Amino acid sequence: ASIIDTVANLAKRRGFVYQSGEITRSAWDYGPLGVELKENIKRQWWKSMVTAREDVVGIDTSIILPREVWVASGLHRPETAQGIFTNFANVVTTARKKPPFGIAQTGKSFPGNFIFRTREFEQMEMEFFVEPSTAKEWHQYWIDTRLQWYVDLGIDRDNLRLYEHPPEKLSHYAERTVDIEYKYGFAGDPWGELEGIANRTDFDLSTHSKHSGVDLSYYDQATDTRYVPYVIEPAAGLTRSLMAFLIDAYSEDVDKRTVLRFDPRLAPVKVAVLPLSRHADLSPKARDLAAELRQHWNVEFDDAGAIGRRYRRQDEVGTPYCVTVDFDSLEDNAVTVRERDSMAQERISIDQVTDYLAVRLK
Template identity: 45%
Template sequence: MPAATMDEVVALAKRRGLIFPASEIYGGIANTYDYGHYGVLLKRNVIDEWWRAMVFERDDIVALDSAIIQHPRTWEASGHLAGFTDPLVQCLGKCKRRFRLDHLQEEAEARGEDPAKVVCPVCGGELSEPRAFNLMFETTIGPVQEAGAAVYLRPETAQGIFLDFKQTLQYARKRPPFGIAQVGKSFRNEITPGNFIFRTLEFEQMEMEFFVPPDEAGKWYDYWRQERLDWYARLGISRERLRLREHTLEELSHYSSGTADVEYLYPIGWSELEGVANRGDFDLTQHAKFSGEKLEWKDPQTGKGYVPHVIEPAAGVGRTILALLCEAYDTDELGGEERTVLRLHPSVAPVKVAVLPLLRKAGHPEVAREVYESLRTRMSAEYDDGGAIGRRYRRQDEIGTPYAVTIDHQTIEDRTVTLRDRDSLTQERVPIAELADELGRRVTNRTPA
């Protein structure tokens, strides 16, 4: 079963300033969201963990940050201009809303209904004939619209990597197998069914293209399928709610010889977290054809070259965050009252430790500030002296803070503090002099997946 309902996660995210609708004072824009303070910290931690796994703990992948606006020919070569479309239908009844036909048909099949007889899910009205619309946002370069000035906001980060393949070969001193990784915004003008941040108009991708000798593509495809599944487990997601789903022949893109989705059991059902695709040599071959540049690797010893094949693990930051929130959301009973808690893994928790002075009498705030200042240079820490201690604990539990440090009477006497664990609720005395090191060990401890 899913770990939480979507309504519970959405309500907590808004209440605690993680994620909330964008432009809300003007009524909002469908499927756009802002990240508050704790959401920003959570997002940054997720991205940092991805960079750690992809670049900092390996020596065969380099980083890139390519431009959002690429030359228009990029999207001709990649096939996005001609084929990046969705089937759009409009309700002919009362509500006049628009929907993606394929989404309505998938939902009908899941309910055991005939997908050829779908109607408007809002008012039950008849639907129009489907028409194709391109998902890319178009804009213009320069102060006026004129022929030849049309450009597009990128719908994926991958193409920038392929455009910079030759440049990267020249400076990075790498040879296949090696990868190029980047994190960045992408934009798709999708008709979306809601579901919070699962599918949005602008989103961040964590994408890596791994260039391999053609005869090694199958081996590396298997490797990256398992490696990416394990990464989510290391972030604290239960393997019972993770799976690898291989695409059928009918689902495969024309250039792919194999694609698998890492799926998570969201409240909306099993859905894609990340795709891992064996893209062959399609992308480099296409860009070589359209640009006139040779995009291949040559052996400096023999002079022989080849166009590498590409294995692509492509993940969404928003979908990863949503999975982590759904997985971490929990309730229990404490002191006769229900407690809501986000059991986030310490590596991604927005705040690692909260410092809570028990009293405001002389000595307590000063020592608490001293402890806080000693911790904040080592990890994300928060000082909280507002309200009763129980209320402060609940506040920190709801944003996922794994540890809380309480300064009390005994602290003034012997320079020890109470260290509280969010999940076990155990409390132990720790000397202030040893606190930073102890928390450092706990926060950075990564158990094998």
């Protein structure tokens, strides 16, 4: 069985995903784990792009926009970029930004290969407006940065690549386009697109200024000049990003153990509290610690079955850490922290546990 089918079956079994209305079929709902993973991915993207950057701001435009907007690109989005292009001047005005600077957005746009190609999906797109003569430079920068982003979130570099669009497959408005591709594992060609980084020149603002009559050019006072900025567009797939991170984290460990090697910042469940048994003495302290940890992270409490099977489930979903409360805990007031990948166990005082986990959960 292909890796893709295996990962999809695992996702369905552990509630990462459910067939949308099990009772299109390419429409998928995200179960608890799936929702948490998707949100973690979105938050990391937003933090790397918006909150961490002085030159990039955020925006959230309506799915249903005026019909003339898409005539330019009582009847009434296939992408999230046109809202950004239309609110360019509004952002320049309120946020007090000048090129080079970015406007970032995430949102839903409207088959097979599991969730690779779905009718309803979510995109994470940024429009970086720059003075034309720097576009190329900036383009490379982003091409690099975006790529490393995935690596920085745990994707094996060897499963990522850059595909340069040849002049024939380049759009008339696109001067250069470099797509990040991931080795999903499809039949035939196993590589697929994940995020497209395009140099759209000044086509978008020019077109919207012509069709709207509003001058969307920027005026640089430093030089007393006026120009239509060039646009660098990193457009990443949220559904495809989740698919890629999930696929890459999958691993089978002589003994065999299934484990999702999620980067901590992306795991749906950060910590699992596991009383050695259902004993009346262990469970209360365990639930107390679990409540303390829920004050910070999404936690799971499981007192069911042997400790080994519970460890197996928590690794199967990629939980970074497990906290075991044994009978010695009732005496020394310490718990056993088990790190997912290495399975290394270390006994630490309960009143420090949180900090011990914080540093490690990034």
